[PDB]
Amino acid sequence: LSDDFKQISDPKGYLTYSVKYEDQFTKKDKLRASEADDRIVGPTVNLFK
Amino acid sequence: VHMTINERAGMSKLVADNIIASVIKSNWVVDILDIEYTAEVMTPSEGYTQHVDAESIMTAPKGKLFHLQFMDGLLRPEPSAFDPPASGEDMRLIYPLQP
Amino acid sequence: RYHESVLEIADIFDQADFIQTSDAVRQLRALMPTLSTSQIRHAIERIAQ
Amino acid sequence: VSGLLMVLFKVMTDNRLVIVGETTTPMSNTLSTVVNNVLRTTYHNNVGVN
Amino acid sequence: YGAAVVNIDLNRDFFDTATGIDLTKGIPLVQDLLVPIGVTAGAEQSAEY
């Protein structure tokens, strides 16, 4: 009787971190831990590298 | 220092290489409790078919089974009386923690 | 000051008919990763397979 | 000002309704304890950032 | 004469690969029983024990 809701799967928030790095001290290479711990921790350690 | 490492995860390559260098240079004794492995006891004549860098012992996934090898040198016959003297010193790093 | 340890049900019940196991199975279960119900289904489907 | 309005509006109309997405359920022994204390069994593959 | 070591292993001829049990590492291992869900298990997992 109504199409009241969209049905997204992996919702986007209203806010996000944005990060400026200092190029001189940053390493371009992606950080690599154990595969599982990277599946969880990984997007974070790469953002606050 | 008898250093004990319960969980390798998150350890830097620099820190690890430095711990190893401390084992060699400062005679550190570094137990690493997180390693699960399956030992194979070799006889002296079959040598060590499968090798292991210190780097891999430090940086292997927490869940994976390592496969170490360990010699039983009980059946190694004595050197001939006139074999040239060995100035070099054979050295070792990895040992089991349990029988 | 306590000592934790297993106690087989056989050591308390004199009624042997309702005793099918021992310390062994608990000791085995200690080795097992904690299992989401979905993993339990995967295991059963595998043993079936 | 208009910015805020359409932010507010876009919030006033977020009729999104979450449904479980792809979700890994890691074997517990493969995770470092600092992660294991945090995990509740399963997480979305799109972990995001914290 | 000259046998350096005499171990007692599980009989691989009995605990066959028809049961899915490898024994080459000296312990039983099974490919896909206790496994992560939503990803590939990964090689040489200890859970296989």
Curated annotation (Swiss-Prot), chain B:
Q: Which domain of life is it from?
A: Viruses
From the record, give the transmembrane residue ranges. none
State its location(s): Virion
**Quaternary structure note:** Homodecamer; each decamer is made up of two conformers of VP2, called VP2A and VP2B. 12 homodecamers assemble to form an icosahedral capsid.
Record family assignment? Belongs to the turreted BTV-fold inner capsid family.
Q: What does this protein do?
A: Inner capsid protein that self-assembles to form an icosahedral capsid with a T=2 symmetry, which consists of 120 copies of VP2, with channels at each of its five-fold vertices. This capsid constitutes the innermost concentric layer of the viral mature particle.
- Kindly provide the name given to this protein in its UniProt entry: Inner capsid protein VP1
Organism of origin is Bombyx mori cytoplasmic polyhedrosis virus
Parent-record interval covered: 1137 to 1235 of 1333
Swiss-Prot record, chain C:
Stretches that traverse the bilayer: none
- Tell me where it resides: Virion
Q: Which residues form the signal peptide?
A: none
Please describe what this protein does.
Inner capsid protein that self-assembles to form an icosahedral capsid with a T=2 symmetry, which consists of 120 copies of VP2, with channels at each of its five-fold vertices. This capsid constitutes the innermost concentric layer of the viral mature particle.
Subunit organization: Homodecamer; each decamer is made up of two conformers of VP2, called VP2A and VP2B. 12 homodecamers assemble to form an icosahedral capsid.
The UniProt similarity line reads: Belongs to the turreted BTV-fold inner capsid family.
What's the name of the protein?
Answer: Inner capsid protein VP1
- Which species is this UniProt entry from? Bombyx mori cytoplasmic polyhedrosis virus
Q: Which residues of the full protein are shown?
A: 940 to 988 of 1333
